[PDB]
């Protein structure tokens, strides 16, 4: 019944992917060992859509952890929900790439893709009818950018008709955790623009901006940032996991948000975002959530939506709520701010609601936005790419693996192409 | 006197569970599936002391179908009638029609045959759906085509939830509605339409519900669909059958798009403070804001109106009431059909759900009417379609299913013919 | 059978309008909920003339409460007879006018008149044969002066042939409860002089003077003043509500008291007015009521009748009484005081009696007087209008809504015109 | 019916904490932050059994803002509403406007928008500040300009603490007051003023407090600001809204400077011996020394006076009382508005703080009135400004912020126009 197979790549993709299984384990009432201890019967109604049943009322996740380094699996296996994963799925290499896209794509990737394709083939045969795949990686580095982008092309060859979702965190200019980030970002987007049908543009800079303004966290760690992005992955797959008044599968939101084949880079968000020291002094009904959803300082991307125009918006909701207040609020945000919305579409909002909210909250929603303001983050990495590429700097490491110099220019031809697409419909 | 029903999409089964619970409580049918001629037109007799409805719930997505299997009304419906698919339509007219529609229609086709072969008094069919999404556009348009070549002569009463001028749940619904209407124009004998924001306005000003949900929207809608067929269930002084809605409301074989409105809709506290009689409800049903569609009837002209009352209502005041409506100069009837009044009566009164938002009323009426008021609505839906069609937006998904840009032009010019047909007929 | 539809405007019109339904509910024996608990069968004989029948032997008033502020309806709904009114009839705005005629007539009125005209249309269609409308407002302020004067023009357009009664309380110079009172009074009379066929000139100053001299109230509130004016509204509509030896409908008194189209501003009064501590020391037959009616300190207007001459007088009576004592007393009041009555009419008194008096009294009457002494209250407000208008004071607020300066002068041309009419026939 | 408030400067929040504690004790709101329609106009309803005020405290200096964070009324207010800066104004109109003002107004602008969007019965705004310092002059003049272009139509009720003729806390306050009044003349609908030595004289002769503090000054001031809005909170026999103060008191669009005075102000021991009725308070409110400004009303003429009573007070004696005020020849009303009386009533009486200096009273009144008595005050402030402006004293700081000597002359000639407007209108 539309089973989704999870797949992880890179250090960050395994961390946020690990947090994804943790947060959904709580609402489903899954123990760290694998047994069920929930309360509602609807949790078992669609537990198979991510997990696999087993003996003793045990449920094993349908995850495949892929990382070229071995230490990443040791940290994930020793986590709170590290033992629930299957030991056979922990496939990994020995010698890391060290922030090199050419290694994880050509030399170090070719020896491991044969070991992961047969595993996901086994998982795809176990389910009754698969819907699609969702992947977590990062444009920076070599593992998540190299290993993830490679098997995306192979999965497209093996499953061209199924949905190919991707949650890809991109770099930022002010927060730079890698010197070779724009080359990996420029080489990765050449594969993401053509192969996958969906993409979520997540930014680490905004993940630091979002925690100061509303959460008021004095000591935020990566685990706190993983809680925000993991909740977004749960909102997109809510209606098939629990019933609702209006269902919206991963395909139902893709057809509305992807007006063209190449324009599929979304912009995520989440609400309610409120600190623990100011939870009592805020309401939880629908109008405060609507204005917070469309707020500029709410999304986890560094893009200014006021500098552009939204192509389409999708706001998945959770929990029992009234439909009149939901529908009427989405009318005024597009009417009062018609300048920041394209006139060549009559309605830029996609609505959907569920009845079973997360634990600890009574009403919540997740934002999915495709807008022309995404180009400002793509040209700056392109400028950092073209600035470093024009002198042929930091290319001798990539050519040692047999990579051609023109492939960087072919990626550059794609880089200024996608930013020009959003400029066309602006 | 029997009739088969079918529910399609998220919109279909969501009101289907809400309407059939209203049907069962009228005939004394408990939810467990048991307690002479009034219930035979919807409910069969399974051997002895057990019944089952004459309907089927079909939907590709399994979340809503299994909710009925795990819901309270489990033993009432058949297990095999709760048909379910494996792949979602996803706001795609094509995906629920060609790829995923072909591998599921064959269980659906032969089931209606055996369901009708056991029956003997089959009047027709009535389908509940919504062209505002993916499942109610493609799969609904396919099943009506395949049974029309088979049956043909039997009637088809469509019930769709159309989008509003400005409020909308989806974004691709002009493409979903413009494609499915190309097939609906030739095979649908009649199609009653309801708007999504209009029904909110009904419970806002009259029922004073500031925060309702879709469950409440289906209750008053269940009163509409049950009242039109109420004459066939119980006895009435002037009986009207299912084929009355075809001849008396369809002036031309292509113009088969009536409207719908219902009154009285009063709260519990307001029911004791507000008088209930034929005069006020007749003036209220013709009120423009009380209609279920955001279209001004003053701009157009009524081709014909079909009145149908319930409860203890003598035929004197209903005739005197419409005589006052004829004298009202604010409205305007078309010269092509001056005597466009069809009145009906049923002794059995409007029911009431336990704990429902609607209050008890000793009498009610369900007014259906055709007019050229929706001519601007089709022009509105066509105008917004030209904006996205000019940019070729959302086209790669439909052709990604198997279709092409050819029939997109066929649906455009078909609406262009439909637009001028309302303009020339309204002269 | 000559149904009258009630209508209210302004704070005072809702208060005295609320008291109007209260006092008549007692003589008709109507419960505060809506059921009947009276004793006489004649109360149901003409209960339809103001009320609407309903299920359970319940009777609901045919009233429409209109006020631009929401707080006025909360006080009326929370009153003793607040629940008997229909909930749907409580139409009202949000943002008050704040003593501005331009707001309630042009900007804040245009958005609400569409919501009240359809309600009175529903009530007018419910009755068999409507006679006319009676309204309660105040010339002071913006709500009663603006909203009331506006829909009076619209009702004239919709119902030009029916009777249009109005109970309008005017300001006074000594009791000044509003700074912008003469502008509102001068702008309101332009509509009242031309649209309505009847008008009752009530004064707040005399409503305090009347309570000191005969009632001897030590602590009078607004509710005590409402009792005097509410009883006056009941006396004018007695003969159609209960049978009588000589019937006088609202049209039967209008034809006698309105000798010209513009001369329709009456002057009300009521009797017997006597304190509780001096009730035993007074009789209740007809001659003491006659001399009390024509007394100068009996009416609820600040006009001196001795300074002018009565055009016409109408004294509706209630309760069983002898006709010789009634007719003979009206002869001597006009004969002995021939100087204070116009010689160009042979008889200035209109007589009419009913058999069913109010509860707690056996003989009573209500005064309706059109006199040339009414002009003294109109010129003083005109002087206050002209004194403030000559320097264009307090006009910048009215021009903000788009009001023209000449419209104040057009009202001024009407102001000195109506006072000159009564001077012609003096 | 709702209204948003804002506090600026040292003067603003010092009375804001003193006024809001008076507001909360009236509605039974405990200081911890919890206990139907009376409190909705100031306090919201957050989910279940919790409220928050509809106001914000903004101030550049953090000493007063953090005192509220560490003060007793911590749980009552929102932690995010307590806005704080990082650099002080220092008696500079320019420093709180151009350098430091620009980097803090943007959090302040968008907060009022979302605070108003969630609301639906927004009547207007009222700001508490003081032009006698730096923060209440520049930043207050900036925020009112930026919301006036946005809203405009909504009212603005300013509350400033002006300096006395001879007593003064600062030395540069003529430059601070003359600059900020140039912006206040065009965008402020009305501005009630209070003098610093006058309120000391109120508690000196009447309340016999020889050694009070600013905390005591804010209590009786809280009675004034709470009494003008008391009609909107509780029910009254003659209701008056917030827009009543704009039309009834502003004769011309530039002359928008009323006065303020309050009575009775009696101690605890004197309250039991001194009779309380409408006659003595009406004669006391028009008493010149009992006013909150050191300006002789005998020199000028009252344009219009707005009376507003509280407690059990019948409308007979209030009309008879003002009738005696009209007969007094010691006062003199202007011929341009003879009937300049506006009386109001509220059934809910004046409250009392536990342990406060004010005693319990069964009735009170808050009398606001415009007049030309402050024409000499503006001439006095302008005269002392010419002494320092002639020597070009204290000018190097203002131009040291970014301004120049140009607008210094614009503020001077603006007062020169304002002075003669009071002289010609008072003829
Ligand atoms: N929101 C979070 N971001 C993270 C986290 N860990 C890393 N990152 C961010 O993602 C950036 C790159 O992602 P990765 O850490 O996975 C580098 P990767 O493992 O793919 O390559 P190698 O480790 O060199 O084999 C990294 O520079 C961080 O900005 C995390 O736990 N949470
Ligand atoms: N005899 C009575 N007179 C009243 C009463 N209430 C007010 N008034 C008088 O009528 C005068 C104005 O009438 P209103 O109170 O209705 C002012 P209105 O509501 O029309 O405008 P807004 O309140 O500003 O929206 C007022 O100044 C009083 O002198 C009352 O209850 N009884
Ligand atoms: N008035 C009303 N409309 C409804 C209700 N349920 C669904 N709808 C409408 O139906 C439209 C979509 O219909 P469907 O084709 O059934 O949607 P779906 O079955 O979820 O299709 P998928 O997204 O592909 O799964 C929505 O836009 C809603 O506005 C309801 O209970 N009341
Ligand atoms: N009556 C009264 N006046 C006050 C009170 N608090 C402050 N003031 C006046 O406010 C004036 C200065 O106002 P502000 O602009 O707020 O002073 P500030 O915030 O300290 O400005 P900086 O010195 O730059 O920090 C002083 O001259 C005081 O006279 C008070 O509690 N009561």
Q: What is the largest CA-CA distance in chain A?
A: 62
Chain breaks in chain B (C to N over 2.5 A) after: 35
Q: Which two tokens stand for residue B144?
A: 């009506």
CB D128, CB D152: distance < 8 Å: no
- Name residues whose C-beta falls within 8 Å of residue D391's C-beta, 6 or more positions apart in sequence: none
DSSP letter at B43 equals B
Regarding beta strands A3-9 and A268-271, do their DSSP bridges make them parallel or antiparallel, or are they unpaired? unpaired
Regarding beta strands D309-311 and D363-371, do their DSSP bridges make them parallel or antiparallel, or are they unpaired? antiparallel
CB B91, CB B176: distance < 8 Å: yes
- If you measure from the C-alpha of residue C363 to the centroid of ligand 3, how many angstroms do you get, rounded to a whole number? 71
What is the C-alpha to C-alpha distance for residues B162 and B154, in angstroms, rounded to an integer? 25
Which 3 state secondary structure label does DSSP give D386? helix
Ligand that lies nearest to the alpha carbon of residue D177, given by its number in the listed order: 4
**Is B33 annotated for ligand binding?**
no
Q: Which two tokens stand for residue D368?
A: 């606001």
Distance from CA of D279 to the nearest CA of C (A): 15
C250: number of Cβ within 10 Å: 20
* Binary contact (B273, C56; C-beta < 8 A): no
Residue from D316, D324, D369 whose CB has the most chain C CBs within 10 Å, to mutate: D316
Nearest Cα residue to atom 32 of ligand 2? C222
Q: Which residue from B198, B184, B193 is spatially nearest to B93, judged by alpha carbons?
A: B184
- Measured in degrees and rounded to the nearest 5, phi and psi for residue C215 equal -85, -30
Q: Which residue from D19, D9, D369, D12 is spatially nearest to D159, judged by alpha carbons?
A: D12
Q: Is D in contact with B (3 or more beta carbon pairs below 8 Å)?
A: no
C218 touches chain D (CB under 8 A): no
What is the C-alpha to C-alpha distance for residues C143 and D344, in angstroms, rounded to an integer? 16
D324 touches chain C (CB under 8 A): no
DSSP letter at D95 equals I
Atom of ligand 1 nearest to the CA of A175: 29
Q: Which residue from B285, B286, B241, B247 is spatially nearest to B265, judged by alpha carbons?
A: B285
Distance from CA of D79 to the nearest CA of A (A): 7
Does residue D88 have its Cβ closer than 6 Å to ligand 4? yes
Nearest Cα residue to atom 10 of ligand 1? A12
Residue from B167, B169, B208 whose CB has the most chain A CBs within 10 Å, to mutate: B169
Q: Is C in contact with D (3 or more beta carbon pairs below 8 Å)?
A: yes
Residues of D whose CB is below 8 A from C11: 238-239
Q: Which two tokens stand for residue C79?
A: 């009153």
What is the C-alpha to C-alpha distance for residues B181 and B135, in angstroms, rounded to an integer? 14
Q: Which residue from C81, C231, C183, C227 is spatially nearest to C395, judged by alpha carbons?
A: C183
Number of Cα atoms under 13 Å in the Cβ half of residue C13: 32
Q: Which residue from C337, C325, C335, C272 is spatially nearest to C298, judged by alpha carbons?
A: C272
C388 touches chain D (CB under 8 A): yes
CB B178, CB B163: distance < 8 Å: no
H or E stretch at B135: helix B135-150
Q: Which residue from D103, D119, D105 is spatially nearest to D154, judged by alpha carbons?
A: D119
Which 3 state secondary structure label does DSSP give B75? coil
H or E stretch at B52: none
Tell me the Cα Rg of chain A. 21
Ligand that lies nearest to the alpha carbon of residue A139, given by its number in the listed order: 1
Residues of C whose CB is below 8 A from D306: 179
Give Cα separations from C90 to B25, C7, C110, C233 (angstroms): 36, 11, 18, 22
Q: To 10 degrees, the CA torsion angle through A190, A191, A197, A202? A: -70
* Binary contact (B171, A247; C-beta < 8 A): no
294-323 of A, contacting B, C-beta below 8 A: 312, 320-323
What is the C-alpha to C-alpha distance for residues C103 and B309, in angstroms, rounded to an integer? 45
Q: Which two tokens stand for residue D178?
A: 């003359």
Q: Which residue from C121, C120, C73 is spatially nearest to C93, judged by alpha carbons?
A: C73
* Binary contact (B272, C86; C-beta < 8 A): no
Q: Which residues pair with C203 in a beta bridge?
A: C170
Distance from CA of D306 to the nearest CA of C (A): 8
Burial class, A368, CB count within 10 angstroms (exposed 0-12 / middle 13-18 / buried 19+): buried
What is the C-alpha to C-alpha distance for residues B250 and D298, in angstroms, rounded to an integer? 85
* Binary contact (D80, A288; C-beta < 8 A): no
CB C192, CB C153: distance < 8 Å: no
CB B203, CB B216: distance < 8 Å: yes
Nearest Cα residue to atom 8 of ligand 2? C12
D326 touches chain A (CB under 8 A): no
What is the C-alpha to C-alpha distance for residues B249 and B256, in angstroms, rounded to an integer? 8
The three state secondary structure string of chain A is CCEEEEEEEHHHHHHHHHHHHHHHHHHHCECCCCCECCCCCHHHHCCCCCEEECHHHCEEECCCEEECCCHHHHHHHCCCCCCCCCCCCCEECCCCCCCCHHHHHHHCCCCCHHHHHHHHHHHHHHCCCEEEEEEEEECCCCHHHHHHHHHHHHHHHHCCCCEEEEEEEECCCCCCCCCCHHHHHHHHHHHHCCCCCCEEEEEHHHHHHHHHHHHCCCCCCHHHHHHHHHHHHHHHCCCCCCCCCECCCHHHHHHHHCCCCCCCEECEEEECCCCHHHCCCCCCCHHHHHHHHCCCCCECCCCCHHHCCEEEEEEEEECCCCHHHHHHHHHHHHHHCHHHECCCCCCCEEEEECCCCCCCCCCEEEEEEEEHHHHHHHHHHHHHHHHHHCCCCCCHHHHCCCCCHHHHHHHHHHHHHHHHHHHHCC
DSSP letter at B163 equals P
Q: Which two tokens stand for residue D30?
A: 């405990």
Q: Is B in contact with A (3 or more beta carbon pairs below 8 Å)?
A: yes
Q: Which residue from C145, C231, C148 is spatially nearest to C187, judged by alpha carbons?
A: C145
What is the C-alpha to C-alpha distance for residues B385 and C145, in angstroms, rounded to an integer? 50
CB D198, CB D260: distance < 8 Å: no
**Is C409 annotated for ligand binding?**
no
Q: Which residue from B382, B5, A140, C98 is spatially nearest to D124, judged by alpha carbons?
A: C98
- Counted residue by residue, chain B has a size of 427
What is the C-alpha to C-alpha distance for residues B412 and C4, in angstroms, rounded to an integer? 57
Q: Which two tokens stand for residue C225?
A: 């003043």
Q: Which residues of B are catalytic?
A: 244
Q: Which chain B residue has the Cα nearest residue C52?
A: B275
CB B45, CB B249: distance < 8 Å: no
Nearest Cα residue to atom 3 of ligand 3? B11
Residue written as tokens 């357009």? Answer: C157
Distance from CA of D144 to the nearest CA of A (A): 23
Q: Which residue from D303, D307, D304, D301 is spatially nearest to D284, judged by alpha carbons?
A: D307
DSSP letter at B61 equals S
* Binary contact (C58, B272; C-beta < 8 A): yes
The three state secondary structure string of chain C is CCEEEEEECHHHHHHHHHHHHHHHHHHHCECCCCEECCCCCHHHHCCCCCEEECHHHEEEECCCCEECCCHHHHHHHCCCCCCCCCCCCCEECCCCCCCCHHHHHHHCCCCCHHHHHHHHHHHHHHCCCEEEEEEEEECCCCHHHHHHHHHHHHHHHHCCCCEEEEEEEECCCCCCCCCCHHHHHHHHHHHHCCCCCCEEEEEHHHHHHHHHHHHCCCCCCHHHHHHHHHHHHHHCCCCCCCCCCECCCHHHHHHHHCCCCCCCEECEEEECCCCHHHCCCCCCCHHHHHHHHCCCCCECCCCCHHHCCEEEEEEEEECCCCHHHHHHHHHHHHHHCHHHECCCCCCCEEEEECCCCCCCCCCEEEEEEEEHHHHHHHHHHHHHHHHHHCCCCCCHHHHCCCCCHHHHHHHHHHHHHHHHHHHHCC
Burial class, C124, CB count within 10 angstroms (exposed 0-12 / middle 13-18 / buried 19+): middle
C88 touches chain B (CB under 8 A): yes
CB B147, CB B125: distance < 8 Å: yes
**Is B28 annotated for ligand binding?**
no
* Binary contact (D1, C71; C-beta < 8 A): yes
A287 touches chain D (CB under 8 A): yes
Residues of A whose CB is below 8 A from D46: 280-283
- If you measure from the C-alpha of residue D76 to the centroid of ligand 4, how many angstroms do you get, rounded to a whole number? 24
Regarding beta strands D302-306 and D363-371, do their DSSP bridges make them parallel or antiparallel, or are they unpaired? antiparallel
Residues of A whose CB is below 8 A from B68: none
Q: Which two tokens stand for residue B97?
A: 């029609």
D342 touches chain C (CB under 8 A): yes
Distance from CA of D78 to the nearest CA of A (A): 6
* Binary contact (B274, C56; C-beta < 8 A): no
B329 touches chain C (CB under 8 A): no
* Binary contact (C60, B275; C-beta < 8 A): yes
CB D105, CB D150: distance < 8 Å: no
Give Cα separations from C313 to C251, C376, D283 (angstroms): 15, 19, 44
- Name residues whose C-beta falls within 8 Å of residue A212's C-beta, 6 or more positions apart in sequence: none
CB A419, CB A378: distance < 8 Å: yes
Tell me the Cα Rg of chain D. 21
Distance from CA of A311 to the nearest CA of B (A): 11
Query: Given in angstroms, what resolution was this structure solved at?
Result: 4.4
* Binary contact (A288, D118; C-beta < 8 A): yes
CB B415, CB B178: distance < 8 Å: yes
Nearest Cα residue to atom 23 of ligand 4? D90
Q: Which two tokens stand for residue A209?
A: 């901006």
- Name residues whose C-beta falls within 8 Å of residue D174's C-beta, 6 or more positions apart in sequence: D381, D384, D385, D388
CB A354, CB A244: distance < 8 Å: yes
Q: Which two tokens stand for residue D315?
A: 């409308």
Residues of D whose CB is below 8 A from C139: none
What is the C-alpha to C-alpha distance for residues A12 and A9, in angstroms, rounded to an integer? 8
What is the C-alpha to C-alpha distance for residues D13 and D7, in angstroms, rounded to an integer? 6
* Binary contact (C56, B272; C-beta < 8 A): yes
Q: Which residue from D319, D64, D159 is spatially nearest to C208, judged by alpha carbons?
A: D319
- Name residues whose C-beta falls within 8 Å of residue D157's C-beta, 6 or more positions apart in sequence: D124, D125, D126, D127, D189, D190, D191, D192, D242, D245
What is the C-alpha to C-alpha distance for residues A188 and A170, in angstroms, rounded to an integer? 10
What is the C-alpha to C-alpha distance for residues C35 and C57, in angstroms, rounded to an integer? 6
What is the C-alpha to C-alpha distance for residues C106 and C397, in angstroms, rounded to an integer? 13
Q: Which chain B residue has the Cα nearest residue C115?
A: B205
Nearest Cα residue to atom 11 of ligand 2? C140
Residue written as tokens 């004649």? Answer: C42
What is the C-alpha to C-alpha distance for residues A369 and A263, in angstroms, rounded to an integer? 12
Q: What is the largest CA-CA distance in chain B?
A: 62
243-272 of D, contacting A, C-beta below 8 A: none
Q: To 10 degrees, the CA torsion angle through D409, D414, D416, D419? A: -150
């Amino acid at each position: 019944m539309r089973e989704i197979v999870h797949i992880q790549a890179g250090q960050c993709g395994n961390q946020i992917g690990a947090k994804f299984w943790e947060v959904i384990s709580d609402e489903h009432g899954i123990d760290p060992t694998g047994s069920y201890h929930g309360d509602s019967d609807l949790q078992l109604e669609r537990i198979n859509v991510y997990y696999n049943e087993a003996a003793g009322n045990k449920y094993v996740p349908r995850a495949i952890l892929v990382d070229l380094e071995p230490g990443t699996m040791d940290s994930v296996r020793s986590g709170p929900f590290g033992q629930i994963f299957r030991p056979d799925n922990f496939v990994f290499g020995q010698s890391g790439a060290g922030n090199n896209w050419a290694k994880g794509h050509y030399t170090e990737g070719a020896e491991l893709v044969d070991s992961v394709l047969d595993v996901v083939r086994k998982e795809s045969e176990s389910c009754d009818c698969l819907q699609g795949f969702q992947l977590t990686h990062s444009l920076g580095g070599g593992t998540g950018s190299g290993m993830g982008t490679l098997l995306i092309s192979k999965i497209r060859e093996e499953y061209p008709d199924r949905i190919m979702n991707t949650f890809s965190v991109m770099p930022s200019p002010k927060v730079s955790d890698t010197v070779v980030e724009p080359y990996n970002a420029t080489l990765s987007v050449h594969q993401l623009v053509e192969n996958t049908d969906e993409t979520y543009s997540i930014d680490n800079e905004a993940l630091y901006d979002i925690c100061f303004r509303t959460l008021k966290l004095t000591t935020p760690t990566y685990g706190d940032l993983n809680h925000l992005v993991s909740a977004t992955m749960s909102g997109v797959t809510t209606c098939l996991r629990f019933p609702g008044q209006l269902n919206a599968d991963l395909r139902k939101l893709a057809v509305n948000m992807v007006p063209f084949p190449r324009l599929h880079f979304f912009m995520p968000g989440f609400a309610p975002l409120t600190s623990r020291g100011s939870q009592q002094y805020r309401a939880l009904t629908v109008p405060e959530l609507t204005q917070q959803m469309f707020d500029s300082k709410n999304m986890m991307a560094a893009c200014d939506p006021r500098h552009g125009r939204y192509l389409t918006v999708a706001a998945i909701f959770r929990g029992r709520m009234s439909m009149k207040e939901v529908d009427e609020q989405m009318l005024n945000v597009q009417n009062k701010n018609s300048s920041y919305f394209v006139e060549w579409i009559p309605n830029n909002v996609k609505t959907a609601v569920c009845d079973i909210p997360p634990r600890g909250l009574k009403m919540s929603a997740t934002f999915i936005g495709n807008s022309t303001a995404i180009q400002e983050l793509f040209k700056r990495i392109s400028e950092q790419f073209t600035a470093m590429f024009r002198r042929k700097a930091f290319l001798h490491w990539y050519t040692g693996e047999g990579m051609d110099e023109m492939e960087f220019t072919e990626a550059e031809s794609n880089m200024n192409d996608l930013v020009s697409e959003y400029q066309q419909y602006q | 006197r029997e009739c088969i029903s079918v529910h399609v999409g998220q919109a279909g089964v969501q009101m289907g569970n809400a309407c059939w619970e209203l049907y069962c409580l009228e005939h004394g049918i408990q939810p467990d599936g048991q307690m002479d001629d009034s219930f035979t037109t919807f409910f069969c007799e399974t051997g002895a002391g057990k019944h089952v409805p004459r309907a089927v719930f079909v939907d590709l997505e399994p979340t809503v179908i299994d909710e009925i299997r795990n819901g309270p009304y489990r033993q009432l419906f058949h297990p095999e009638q709760l048909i379910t698919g494996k792949e979602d339509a996803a706001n795609n007219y094509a995906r629920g029609h060609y790829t995923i529609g072909k591998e599921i229609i064959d269980p659906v086709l032969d089931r209606i045959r055996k369901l009708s072969d056991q029956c003997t008094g089959l009047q027709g069919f009535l389908v509940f759906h919504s062209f505002g999404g993916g499942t109610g556009s493609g799969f609904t348009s396919l099943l009506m085509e395949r049974l029309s070549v088979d049956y043909g002569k039997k009637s088809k009463l469509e019930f769709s939830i159309y989008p509003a001028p400005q409020v909308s749940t989806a974004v691709v619904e002009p493409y979903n509605s413009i494609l499915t209407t190309h097939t609906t124009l030739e095979h649908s004998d009649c199609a009653f339409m309801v708007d999504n924001e209009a029904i909110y306005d009904i419970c806002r000003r009259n029922l004073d519900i500031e925060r309702p949900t879709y469950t409440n929207l289906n209750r008053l809608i269940s009163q509409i669909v049950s009242s039109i067929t109420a004459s066939l269930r119980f006895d009435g002084a002037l009986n009207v059958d299912l084929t009355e809605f075809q001849t008396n409301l369809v002036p031309y074989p292509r113009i088969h798009f009536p409207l719908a409105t219902y009154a009285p809709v009063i709260s519990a506290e307001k029911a004791y403070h507000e008088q209930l009689s034929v005069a006020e409800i007749t003036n209220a049903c013709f009120e423009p804001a009380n209609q279920m569609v955001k279209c001004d009837p003053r701009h157009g002209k009524y081709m014909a109106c079909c009145l149908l009352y319930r409860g203890d209502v003598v035929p004197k005041d209903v005739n005197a009431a419409i005589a006052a409506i004829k004298t009202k100069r604010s409205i305007q009837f078309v010269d092509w059909c001056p005597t466009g009044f069809k009145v009906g009566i049923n002794y059995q009164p409007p029911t009431v759900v336990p704990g429902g938002d609607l209050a008890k009323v000793q009498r009610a009426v369900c007014m259906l009417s055709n007019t050229t008021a929706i001519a601007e609505a089709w022009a509105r839906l066509d105008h917004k379609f030209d904006l996205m069609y000019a940019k070729r937006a959302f086209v790669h998904w439909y052709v990604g299913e198997g279709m092409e840009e050819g029939e997109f032009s066929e649906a455009r010019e078909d609406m262009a013919a439909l637009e001028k047909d309302y303009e020339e007929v309204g002269i």
